[PDB]
Amino acid sequence: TTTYPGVYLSEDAVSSFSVNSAATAVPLFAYDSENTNTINKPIQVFRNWAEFTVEYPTPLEDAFYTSLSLWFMHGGGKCYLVNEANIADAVAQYDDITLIVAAGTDTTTYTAFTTVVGQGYRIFGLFDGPKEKIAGTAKPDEVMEEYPTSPFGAVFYPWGTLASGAAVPPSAIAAASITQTDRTRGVWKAPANQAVNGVTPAFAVSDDFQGKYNQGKALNMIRTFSGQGTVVWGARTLEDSDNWRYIPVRRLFNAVERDIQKSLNKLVFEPNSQPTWQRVKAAVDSYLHSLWQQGALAGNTPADAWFVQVGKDLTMTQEEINQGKMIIKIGLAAVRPAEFIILQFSQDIAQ
Amino acid sequence: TTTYPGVYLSEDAVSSFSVNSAATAVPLFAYDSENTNTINKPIQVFRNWAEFTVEYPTPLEDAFYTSLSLWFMHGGGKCYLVNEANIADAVAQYDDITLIVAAGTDTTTYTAFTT
Amino acid sequence: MSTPAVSHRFLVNFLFNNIPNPFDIAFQRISGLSRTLEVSQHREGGENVRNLWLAEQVNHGSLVLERGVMNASPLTLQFDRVLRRESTQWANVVIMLLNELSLPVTTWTLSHALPVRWQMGDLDAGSNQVLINTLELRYQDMRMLGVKL
Amino acid sequence: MSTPAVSHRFLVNFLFNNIPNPFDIAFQRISGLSRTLEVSQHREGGENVRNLWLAEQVNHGSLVLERGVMNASPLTLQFDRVLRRESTQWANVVIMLLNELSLPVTTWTLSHALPVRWQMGDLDAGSNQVLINTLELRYQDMRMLGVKL
Amino acid sequence: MSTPAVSHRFLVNFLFNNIPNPFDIAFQRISGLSRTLEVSQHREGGENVRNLWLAEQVNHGSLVLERGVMNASPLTLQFDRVLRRESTQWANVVIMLLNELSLPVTTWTLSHALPVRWQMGDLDAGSNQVLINTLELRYQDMRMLGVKL
Amino acid sequence: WRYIQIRLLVSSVEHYLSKLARAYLFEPNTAPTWMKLKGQVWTWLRQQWLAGAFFGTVEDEAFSLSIGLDETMTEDDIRHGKMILQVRLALLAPAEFIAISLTLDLRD
């Protein structure tokens, strides 16, 4: 309460975090339906840490509070608290979401993840591993059966043990290494080896343990090393195929397919004619050439990195023109990461 | 066998040779017909030392092994192991050969050289 | 004969011990690496027509770098720490040229490079130019690699 | 990638202890801030191939300023007092670039700057030019801020 | 904002003690008045990151004047006496710029100026130029006045 | 907020930082005057850290400044004429108790 024109000395100051957002990382944090200390507003928008503490001022110890407070302290821009019941409708209404972050949530985010993937909304889910210690005599098939077999998701087992004693969901550890990667390296680079601060893995994980959980459904460990403290260690999705392994090459095409339709939605209701088809394929060639020359596409020439194709005997027929359709086909090569490094050693004494 | 995403420490490492080829030297190494430790494939193509040791992994002591291992350690690009019987047809089919190298071979490479 | 190497494509990789990730930073104007051997001339009594040069000590040059004032990288945050004397960490630098495809044709590979000088460009009211800042490192050893030596 | 910073928009804020109000003065030609670390080379006995650079002492440059002969500001009245030796007051200087909107993208923030030199331009009968006077300060420390470091 | 001062209109007034009348002489090329304060850098034991500049002694520049070879004025007759060592008289000089009307906008006001150097122009057979002679004075103090400081 | 010199140091910083704050008082609420105020406060707080008043072997753990539009303020705070600046400090602790220990260290 400011009355006089002077200088006010208040001493109840709290922390603050500067926004260092990425445009390709706008997540959805799902909070549980049977949660008592959330506002009855089912969908709520948080652009920064200052708007989050005017609605949640006391520091809670729940799954949604420690996910968001770990989000905003690593940059992070606008984000959504959506109830578990309205996750398939908040993606369908708000047009901006790129990530579905299950912040300590099971079996209801999963069935609403597989709804919006079948509807085609170009999202990427970040699920959770078991909160309990996986034994080692447990089998990777019986442990990984809760999770969908779609290439739009990753699991991330080891939970967090935040420095204030609270427990961080491991989807929030994974989403805070996506913000720091989508600035400094881009969406085509893996979210793995970037280190997230202020968190600690609850369990020590060996690499004999991760070898069982890598092929098949890809658990995607969260491991700490000397030096690089608590990175996420793994970048594979929930299917082991030649195309849609590797979280980079799925999230690259999600960014390509969304930045192309944002460019081509300004060409809808144009006359379906041959001058309009040339304006489509030159708006995609101009997008993909800039994306090639910043390292996102694999190819040492523009003919090996992408192609755009549209015609009247190429991609669509005259009986299909008359329905208002405009079929463009676009193929483009992505860069696969390195995952294994073999150090082959020889020596011989005094030689 | 790579399972986990980490770093693998293997200690059965062997030698390796970088290719420093010439385009005008693509030879034909002729191995003997009555040779026991060659693959029944009569004509076989070897672009480098790595493709030669995936088919001949143990170090032999024969005329064709010590000719090729001395070839690849001095640069050397693609080359052919051709049986003595098919030397007049491997030159006629593969369009690329500039040298006929008799790697310990007599009187049969000679009559197929003059063909 | 094979074509000579042009001088307008180059990558630079840094590796500090403060910083856990190796980072790659684009520069404008890498200056050039010298390496002198520092001989000395001796004069003998009866010999007046030949010279005598005696080898002593290899002297390495300095790595002068130029780039524009852009967002704060892990290297301009690191010169800020060393020139405020908060750290004296040095890095292993790898510089390499690229051919038409992507391939490294020559590599220079500096060792224990220490940030020693920051130099800011001029602020002028009629200028029409990017603000370029000049960075400078002193390294201990140098080891050139590659196929185009 | 974000666009680099051009060098033709800049504000300078001064804060003396003689003068009660902080004042902001437009200049033409801020020169440029250097910061050298002053290493020294040591030669070891048995080592002839590597170098050894030992860190000593950070040297800061000088703030050279240029503006036209205009009405008497609180800074040209202050150099007049220091160069007449009536005061030895020094100021905390804040220099900052501006982007397209108004926003400070980099800030340089000098400490205890002391006016040390006045230099007047030439008076020439055929000249067609503004009389520019050159001002020069020696500061103790320097601390660069901002998002474009 | 008010318009800056251009540098092609200026009066110079001299006052010697030999000469009873103050005289006003038109020049071509008054050089420019500097005023340096001559600091010195001290290095402290435990402090490696800041600098320390200590004020000593104000140094004034020199008044270099240029005009053509014209009729004998009371100032070229006075340099002739001082450079023949017949007098060692010095003068109080007042230099001032003029605005569009007539008004003095800045004034420089030198004290005890001593004629120290005469320099004649070149005699060349193909030249097409006025013979310019260069005059130079060393003064003791300097005190700038006016509204455009 | 025990230890008298902690209450008297941080109010000696209140007395000077509010002296140069009200120097920048009836200025615009534009972003240049926010950074004109950080640059003066950052300079002064760094000199007191190098004079021995604050704890910390690096500047990042001695003090902090955070003025800005969505760091401390908001657009509703700007239109009411506010300019909010945050200072964090790290202070020194007394040596009230000396807990001497002795170790024998046998060594043959």
Would you list the domain boundaries of chain D?
A: 1-149
A152 touches A193 (CB < 8 A): no
- Please give the angle made by the CA atoms of A75, A77 and A83, to the nearest 5 degrees: 120
- Please give the angle made by the CA atoms of D38, D42 and D47, to the nearest 5 degrees: 145
What is the C-alpha separation between F83 and A280, in angstroms, rounded?
A: 49
Distance (Å) from the alpha carbon of D109 to chain F's nearest alpha carbon: 6
Query: In F, which residues are within 8 Å of C86 by CB distance?
Result: 58-59
Query: In D, which residues are within 8 Å of F44 by CB distance?
Result: 92
Going by C-beta distance under 8 Å and a sequence separation of 6 or more, which residues neighbour residue A160? A66, A70, A167, A168, A169, A170, A172, A173, A199, A200, A201, A202, A222
F75 touches F102 (CB < 8 A): no
Residue in B5, B8, B14 closest to A343 by CB: B8
What is the C-alpha separation between B43 and B57, in angstroms, rounded?
A: 18
A188 touches A296 (CB < 8 A): yes
What is the C-alpha separation between C113 and E47, in angstroms, rounded?
A: 24
Indicate the residue type of F93: A
Q: What is the CA radius of gyration of chain C?
A: 20
Q: What is the CA radius of gyration of chain A?
A: 23
State residue A182 phi and psi, 5-degree precision. Answer: -75, -15
What is the C-alpha separation between F61 and F57, in angstroms, rounded?
A: 7
Segment holding D60, helix H or strand E: strand D59-60
Q: How many residues does chain D have?
A: 149
A350 touches A344 (CB < 8 A): no
Q: Using CB atoms within 10 A of its CB, is residue C136 exposed (0-12), middle (13-18) or buried (19+)?
A: buried
What is the C-alpha separation between E15 and E92, in angstroms, rounded?
A: 5
User: Please, what's the largest Cα pairwise distance for chain E?
Assistant: 67
E133 touches E120 (CB < 8 A): yes
Q: How many residues does chain B have?
A: 115
End-to-end CA distance of chain E: 15
Going by C-beta distance under 8 Å and a sequence separation of 6 or more, which residues neighbour residue A65? A56, A59
Residue in D20, D22, D111 closest to F24 by CB: D22
- Please give the angle made by the CA atoms of A26, A32 and A33, to the nearest 5 degrees: 120
Q: How many residues does chain F have?
A: 108
E104 touches E97 (CB < 8 A): yes
Indicate the residue type of B110: Y
Query: In A, which residues are within 8 Å of F74 by CB distance?
Result: 50
DSSP state of D30: E
C129 in reach of chain A (CB within 8 A): no
F36 in reach of chain D (CB within 8 A): yes
Indicate the residue type of F65: L
Tokens of A17: 């975090």
Is the CB of F20 less than 8 angstroms away from the CB of D15?
yes
Three-state helix/strand/coil letters over B22-58: CCCCCEEEEECCCCCCCCCCCEEEECCHHHHHCCCCC
State residue E64 phi and psi, 5-degree precision. Answer: -100, 125
- Which residue do the tokens 């299917």 mark? A239
Tokens of B74: 């001095």
E49 in reach of chain C (CB within 8 A): yes
Going by C-beta distance under 8 Å and a sequence separation of 6 or more, which residues neighbour residue F88? A13, F63, F64
F71 touches A16 (CB < 8 A): yes
Within 10 angstroms of residue E31's Cβ, the number of other Cβ atoms is 19
Q: Do chains E and B touch (3 or more CB pairs under 8 A)?
A: no
Which residue pairs, CB below 8 angstroms and at least 24 apart, start in E52-57?
A: E52/D140, E53/D114, E53/D116, E53/D138, E53/D140, E55/D88, E55/D114
CA-to-CA dists, residue A34 to A28, A83, E51, E130, angstroms = 18, 10, 63, 100
C143 in reach of chain E (CB within 8 A): no
Q: Using CB atoms within 10 A of its CB, is residue D3 exposed (0-12), middle (13-18) or buried (19+)?
A: exposed
What is the C-alpha separation between C78 and C84, in angstroms, rounded?
A: 10
CA-to-CA dists, residue C86 to A128, A258, C9, C83, D61, angstroms = 40, 45, 34, 8, 20
D114 touches E39 (CB < 8 A): yes
**DSSP H stretches of helix in E29-110:** 76-83
What is the C-alpha separation between A300 and C99, in angstroms, rounded?
A: 11
Query: In A, which residues are within 8 Å of F70 by CB distance?
Result: 19, 47-48, 50
Q: Using CB atoms within 10 A of its CB, is residue C106 exposed (0-12), middle (13-18) or buried (19+)?
A: middle
> What is the three-class DSSP state of A306?
strand
Is the CB of D107 less than 8 angstroms away from the CB of F35?
yes
What is the C-alpha separation between A134 and A143, in angstroms, rounded?
A: 9
Nearest to A19 by CA among A79, A69, A73, A100: A73
> What is the three-class DSSP state of A142?
helix
> What is the three-class DSSP state of A11?
coil
Tokens of C69: 């004032």
- For residues A134-173, b (16+ Cβ closer than 10 Å) or e, as one string? beeeeebeebbeebbeebbbbbbbbbbbbeeebbbbbbbb
What is the C-alpha separation between D93 and D10, in angstroms, rounded?
A: 13
D48 in reach of chain E (CB within 8 A): no
What is the C-alpha separation between D112 and D137, in angstroms, rounded?
A: 9
- Residue C14, strand partner residues: C23
What is the C-alpha separation between F95 and F81, in angstroms, rounded?
A: 45
Task: Kindly give the pairing relationship between strand E29-30 and strand D123-124.
Answer: antiparallel
What is the C-alpha separation between A237 and F89, in angstroms, rounded?
A: 45
- Which residue do the tokens 């609605």 mark? A55
Query: In D, which residues are within 8 Å of F20 by CB distance?
Result: 15, 22
Nearest to B35 by CA among B89, B87, B107, B85: B85
CA-to-CA dists, residue A273 to A156, A203, A308, A318, F19, angstroms = 48, 61, 17, 11, 70
Residue in E8, E43, E149 closest to D124 by CB: E8
What is the C-alpha separation between D117 and A322, in angstroms, rounded?
A: 81
Query: In C, which residues are within 8 Å of F59 by CB distance?
Result: 84, 86
Within 10 angstroms of residue A4's Cβ, the number of other Cβ atoms is 6
CA-to-CA dists, residue E79 to E73, E123, E140, angstroms = 10, 21, 18
Distance (Å) from the alpha carbon of E48 to chain C's nearest alpha carbon: 8
A228 touches C20 (CB < 8 A): yes
Distance (Å) from the alpha carbon of A198 to chain F's nearest alpha carbon: 16
E59 touches E36 (CB < 8 A): yes
Nearest to D134 by CA among D68, D84, D74: D68
Within 10 angstroms of residue D131's Cβ, the number of other Cβ atoms is 23
What is the C-alpha separation between F13 and F47, in angstroms, rounded?
A: 12
Segment holding B83, helix H or strand E: strand B79-83
**DSSP H stretches of helix in D22-132:** 76-83
Nearest to A26 by CA among A78, A73, A66, A82: A78
B84 touches B109 (CB < 8 A): yes
A123 touches A117 (CB < 8 A): yes
Question: Does some domain include residue F107?
Answer: no
Helices F31-49 and F4-21 sit at what angle, rounded to 10 degrees? Answer: 140
Three-state helix/strand/coil letters over chain C: CCCCCCCCCEEEEECCCCCCCCEECCCCCCCCCCEECCCEECCCCCCCCCCCEECCCCEECCEEEEEECCCCCCCHHHHHHHHCCCCCCCEEEEEEEECCCCCEEEECCEEEEEEEEEECCCEECCCCCECEEEEEEECCEECCEECCC
- For residues E78-108, b (16+ Cβ closer than 10 Å) or e, as one string? bbeebeeeeeeebbbbbbbbeeeeeebbbbb
A150 touches A169 (CB < 8 A): no
Tokens of E142: 């300097």
F17 touches F83 (CB < 8 A): no
What is the C-alpha separation between D147 and D144, in angstroms, rounded?
A: 10
CA-to-CA dists, residue A182 to A247, C32, D70, E122, angstroms = 13, 34, 50, 71
Is the CB of C69 less than 8 angstroms away from the CB of D5?
yes
Indicate the residue type of B56: Y
Nearest to A205 by CA among A117, A287, A134, A152: A134
What is the C-alpha separation between F62 and A9, in angstroms, rounded?
A: 20
C38 touches D43 (CB < 8 A): no
DSSP assignment of A220-276, as one string?
Answer: --EE--SSSTTEE-----SS--TTT-SHHHHHHHHHHHHHHHHHHGGGTTS--SHHH
Q: Which residue of B has its CA nearest to A209?
A: B4
Tokens of A267: 């060409």
Within 10 angstroms of residue C1's Cβ, the number of other Cβ atoms is 3
- Which residues in chain D (103-122) have CB-CB distances under 8 A to chain C? 106
Query: In B, which residues are within 8 Å of A233 by CB distance?
Result: 5-6
Q: What is the CA radius of gyration of chain D?
A: 20
Segment holding A46, helix H or strand E: strand A43-46
> Among positive and negative, which fits the CA dihedral B53, B59, B65, B69?
positive
Task: Kindly give the pairing relationship between strand E132-138 and strand E63-68.
Answer: antiparallel
C55 touches C39 (CB < 8 A): yes
What is the C-alpha separation between F49 and F65, in angstroms, rounded?
A: 14
Question: Does some domain include residue F17?
Answer: yes
Q: Which residue of D has its CA nearest to E97?
A: D123
Domain that holds residue F55: 3-93
> What is the three-class DSSP state of A130?
coil
Going by C-beta distance under 8 Å and a sequence separation of 6 or more, which residues neighbour residue A268? none
Is the CB of C84 less than 8 angstroms away from the CB of E49?
yes
Helices A274-292 and A247-264 sit at what angle, rounded to 10 degrees? Answer: 140
**DSSP H stretches of helix in chain F:** 4-21, 31-49, 75-79
Q: Which residue of E has its CA nearest to C82?
A: E49
Method: cryo-EM
Which residue pairs, CB below 8 angstroms and at least 24 apart, start in D115-118?
A: D115/D78, D115/D79, D115/D82, D115/D83, D115/D90, D115/E37, D116/E36, D116/E37, D116/E38, D116/E39, D116/E53, D117/E34, D117/E35, D117/E36, D117/E37, D118/D79, D118/D83, D118/E34, D118/E35
Indicate the residue type of A115: T
DSSP state of A334: B
End-to-end CA distance of chain C: 15
Nearest to D35 by CA among C29, C120, C28: C120
What is the C-alpha separation between A10 and F9, in angstroms, rounded?
A: 16
Nearest to A20 by CA among F70, F60, D3: F70
Count CA within 13 A, CB hemisphere, residue A59.
Answer: 8
Residue in E31, E51, E58 closest to D122 by CB: E31
E48 in reach of chain C (CB within 8 A): yes
What is the C-alpha separation between A14 and A25, in angstroms, rounded?
A: 27
Task: Kindly give the pairing relationship between strand A341-344 and strand B7-10.
Answer: parallel
Phi and psi based region of residue D32 (left: phi greater than 0; alpha: psi -120 to 50; beta: remaining): left
State residue F23 phi and psi, 5-degree precision. Answer: -70, -40
Phi and psi based region of residue A280 (left: phi greater than 0; alpha: psi -120 to 50; beta: remaining): alpha
Tokens of D61: 């440059």
> Among positive and negative, which fits the CA dihedral D14, D15, D19, D21?
positive
State residue A117 phi and psi, 5-degree precision. Answer: -75, -40
Tokens of A243: 């195309």
State residue D80 phi and psi, 5-degree precision. Answer: -65, -35
Tokens of C67: 């780039």
Indicate the residue type of C54: L
Residue in C83, C126, C131 closest to D35 by CB: C83
Task: Kindly give the pairing relationship between strand A124-126 and strand A153-154.
Answer: parallel
- Residue B101, strand partner residues: B29
CA-to-CA dists, residue C131 to C27, D59, D145, angstroms = 13, 22, 16
